[PDB]
Design a protein around this ligand. Sequence first.
Ligand SMILES: *[C@@H]1O[C@H](CO)[C@@H](O[C@@H]2O[C@H](CO)[C@@H](O[C@@H]3O[C@H](CO)[C@@H](O)[C@H](O)[C@@H]3O)[C@H](O)[C@H]2NC(C)=O)[C@H](O)[C@H]1NC(C)=O
Ligand SMILES: *[C@@H]1O[C@H](CO)[C@@H](O[C@@H]2O[C@H](CO)[C@@H](O)[C@H](O)[C@H]2NC(C)=O)[C@H](O)[C@H]1NC(C)=O
Ligand SMILES: *[C@@H]1O[C@H](CO)[C@@H](O)[C@H](O)[C@H]1NC(C)=O
Ligand SMILES: *[C@@H]1O[C@H](CO)[C@@H](O)[C@H](O)[C@H]1NC(C)=O
Lengths: 194, 592
Amino acid sequence: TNLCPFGEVFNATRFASVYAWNRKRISNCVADYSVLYNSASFSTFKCYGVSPTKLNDLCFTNVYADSFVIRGDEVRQIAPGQTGKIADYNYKLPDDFTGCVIAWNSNNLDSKVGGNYNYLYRLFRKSNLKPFERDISTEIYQAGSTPCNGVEGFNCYFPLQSYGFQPTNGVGYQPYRVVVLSFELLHAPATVCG
Amino acid sequence: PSTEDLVNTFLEKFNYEAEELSYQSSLASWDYNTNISDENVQKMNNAGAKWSAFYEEQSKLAKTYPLEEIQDSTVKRQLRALQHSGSSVLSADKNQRLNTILNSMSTIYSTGKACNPSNPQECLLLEPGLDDIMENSKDYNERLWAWEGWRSEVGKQLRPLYEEYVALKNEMARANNYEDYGDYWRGDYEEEWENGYNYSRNQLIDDVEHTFTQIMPLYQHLHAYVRTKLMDTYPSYISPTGCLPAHLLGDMWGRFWTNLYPLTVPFGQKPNIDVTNAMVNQSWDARRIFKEAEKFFVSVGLPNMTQGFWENSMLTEPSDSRKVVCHPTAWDLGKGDFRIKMCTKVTMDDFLTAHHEMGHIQYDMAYAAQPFLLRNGANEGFHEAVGEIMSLSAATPNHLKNIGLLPPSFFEDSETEINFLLKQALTIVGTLPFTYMLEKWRWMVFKGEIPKDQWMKTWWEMKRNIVGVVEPVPHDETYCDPASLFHVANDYSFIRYYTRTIYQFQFQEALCQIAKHEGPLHKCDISNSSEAGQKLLEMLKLGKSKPWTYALEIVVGAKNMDVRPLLNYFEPLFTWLKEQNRNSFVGWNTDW
Ligand SMILES: *[C@@H]1O[C@H](CO)[C@@H](O[C@@H]2O[C@H](CO)[C@@H](O[C@@H]3O[C@H](CO)[C@@H](O)[C@H](O)[C@@H]3O)[C@H](O)[C@H]2NC(C)=O)[C@H](O)[C@H]1NC(C)=O
Ligand SMILES: *[C@@H]1O[C@H](CO)[C@@H](O[C@@H]2O[C@H](CO)[C@@H](O)[C@H](O)[C@H]2NC(C)=O)[C@H](O)[C@H]1NC(C)=O
Ligand SMILES: *[C@@H]1O[C@H](CO)[C@@H](O)[C@H](O)[C@H]1NC(C)=O
Ligand SMILES: *[C@@H]1O[C@H](CO)[C@@H](O)[C@H](O)[C@H]1NC(C)=O
């Protein structure tokens, strides 16, 4: 059994915007967690629906690693029960989540002077997302009865707004990278162990 | 969907874009203030133009939503605020007209330079020199010359400009559903949607006057004291039972009687606490000043500064590396970037000033959770008042002993307390009447009650009746002395200082009463009173989300302005003045 190099999942050239939360399938390998806390430098390391390290050397079903960059103030939004913007229309964990949530300040890399406006977030949506749903659409959010004919206007706004990350910003508006580790568990066979 | 749902969508957009734009503008300006380069100037202008355009269009769009159909007041208030274009309603020709007139008045005020009545080489500018003269000179002749020069050359020019400015400004107000430009200004205090909390606009006039009456006795006795001592310096011109000549008030406009302390210093031998030398001896630095301030606010319960604050704020002159504006300024760039710009120096003055400005910072740090439109002080006077209360609590000899800038067994003597209270009274109690006078004149002028033919006439009449000041030389209607004040030629409101002053003492009294402090309010330190910090925060977090009356009630326990706190703060000085005036006259013959 070969070690699951979360390296690719955690350390990376670039991270995707929350509206495009990237998912990688951990499988056919072995992966510890004590080591992860050992990796340290993690602002938030909260695993839900499992004991702290009772899984350290245990096996589970397909493990999915979702990665995105959000604001520190929105880090709370990434948890069962939340009702914020990021949770409702960008990424939504279930009320019975059985995985992990890891997050670290990325101000040194994902921010630049002049503003790193590359990262984006969905501001408006016609209905709340569903658990682990995604929505890479780029369509005007028709607020009222009058059609929008694909042009911005009164009660006709765009649904993907930019993120202004600058080093001078405060922690609350600072870029934090996030990696959620999905640990579905059932009698089904396993490939991820520790 | 309901118009309200549509509104929420609109606002939730505006904020999510306006905030970013305001941050861009703020950061570019920080560059042009922390650095002064033609480039930075142009960059600042581009960013300002984009912010302008945003607010302009978003205002028009907000008007299409109808406030009446909005029910949640919070949403209603945000929308209301955004629905105040102003200039737009006027034909763009008239918009340019008013812009050009205001720019011309501003340029006259800035470029204005008055020359000697004799020496052709003594032509000096308004602020660079004439101010200094009128603030630290003791010659009737010289001061009269400077006074007449400013209100003649600079004033007479502005007279026609202001005559048209009132017309265009009132036109704007009426086109924005306001009876006069005065009502438009007074609506800054307007608030609604509660049981009684709601304040109307004219009720501001009512309240300002019913408070000024209660302050009048104090100003009369202070007037008598000042009149007598000034008489003993300029005995050739000061009647013992009449008004005082304006050119003798310590500033070009007689708005602050602070420079009269050496001429009106009770006692005079006794010294005043000046920890400046003590700080220099304790090798304090700019950081240490601001760190002590942080510690203070920590004690009362508020958070400490953001790491970004210390990391990006400019607290010391930029060596000679850069050219910079020095006027102390607090900064809410949005997005959690809080900063302070001050050419801090190791003096008691800068220490107290830093407390004030960091108090502004804390207010801003306390209403960030609110939406952009609701992220501001409760009214136009709440911000300045909180900063002041911080400085007023740091000046107390107690906090000076605590930080270790004052000996451990130092004790105040009644003579020193009275010196300090008198200095305070000049700066505070002296401007109050002048402030009321100026703003009442402008309100009535915009309303139309004062015709131009009696436009300067009533002005000086009012001075005599209210401020108790008289014209050294008769000024016909060709003059326009009112515009000689920056806040006037530059279209600013002037009532904020009256309100700020009244409020700050109400706040301070509440906060002390919560710290169980006992004794003269002038000797109160909220330090280490977690309860005081909690009450203050429970107001500060509100921003302008809740009615200004409600914020006040949360902290002082009333729904309107009261002067009893101020009178209590100055009561010792009041009584001392009463006795010192027993053998003189308290009052002033209007006509003289
Ligand atoms: C609010 O509390 C602070 C902290 O007590 C007051 O500042 C002054 O702090 C020093 C300690 O940091 C106090 O006294 C010294 O304590 C040290 C440590 O044990 C000891 O070596 C010395 O012998 C001395 O006892 C000092 O008394 C204290 N000042 C006070 C209590 O007035 C701050 O002054 C407090 N706020 C107000 C308004 O007094
Ligand atoms: C103040 O302004 C000057 C001139 O505008 C700035 O000088 C910059 O110097 C760097 C490095 O040589 C150039 O690449 C930049 O083009 C210059 N300015 C700008 C605006 O791009 C200077 O950096 C500014 N700030 C400070 C703190 O000195
Ligand atoms: C890659 O990421 C893992 C995540 O735990 C970390 O432990 C490891 O040190 C990283 N390797 C680097 C940064 O070279
Ligand atoms: C800032 O305040 C926090 C919370 O009270 C405190 O834990 C921290 O020690 C303070 N900062 C410093 C430098 O002491």
